[PDB]
Amino acid sequence: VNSFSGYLKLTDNVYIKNADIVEEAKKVKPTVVVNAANVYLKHGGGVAGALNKATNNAMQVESDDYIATNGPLKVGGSCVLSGHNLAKHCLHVVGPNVNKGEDIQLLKSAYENFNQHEVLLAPLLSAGIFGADPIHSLRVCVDTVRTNVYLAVFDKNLYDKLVSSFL
Ligand SMILES: CNc1cnc(C(=O)N2CC(c3noc(O)n3)C2)cn1
Numbered sequence: 001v002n003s004f005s006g007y008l009k010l011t012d013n014v015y016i017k018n019a020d021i022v023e024e025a026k027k028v029k030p031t032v033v034v035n036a037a038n039v040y041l042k043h044g045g046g047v048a049g050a051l052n053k054a055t056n057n058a059m060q061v062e063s064d065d066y067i068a069t070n071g072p073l074k075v076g077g078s079c080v081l082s083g084h085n086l087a088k089h090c091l092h093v094v095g096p097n098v099n100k101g102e103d104i105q106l107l108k109s110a111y112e113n114f115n116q117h118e119v120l121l122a123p124l125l126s127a128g129i130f131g132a133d134p135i136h137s138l139r140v141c142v143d144t145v146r147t148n149v150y151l152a153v154f155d156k157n158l159y160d161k162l163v164s165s166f167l
Pocket of ligand 1: 020021022045046047050123124125127128129134152153154155158
């Protein structure tokens with residue numbers, strides 16, 4: 001028994017809620033929040049910018065030090081950094097950005113990073129400004145992640161469509 005509330009059970013291990021992931025993290029303070037990162041950990045907009053803004057830019061400062069030491073992530077890859085005021089840890093995961101010509105087949109590799117963590121609060125990877133169809137992202141999530149994932153989907157209309165069309 002954990003502290004997530006009002007999630008709709010989609011599968012054995014996937015739950016879903018209409019919520020802004022930033023607001024959910026501030027309330028729950030989960031062990032792991034997933035960021036929709038890019039390989040440079042440049043969190044200017046989207047989920048990353050919203051999460052980073054909620055940390056008063058401390059996420060960006062930590063991220064810049066990480067990149068200066070380690071270089072960029074791979075598309076499909078991840079790193080674990082601090083969760084600041086939002087979580088114990090932030091798992092920065094790079095889904096493919098369709099708008100940049102990245103291979104959608106890398107979405108499954110991106111979701112595999114979630115399996116290293118027992119429980120996560122997460123958005124749908126490659127959604128929003130990453131340009132993939134959320135319905136596909138949810139299918140890959142369900143078919144790839146075996147650990148307990150709590151999906152916070154910002155758009156109420158997208159949320160309703162995700163649930164209603166779920167197989
Ligand atoms: C001000 N707070 C926020 C929160 N989120 C975003 C964002 O860019 N997105 C992409 C959206 C999404 N649709 O589905 C899934 O899983 N995520 C959520 C921006 N600002």
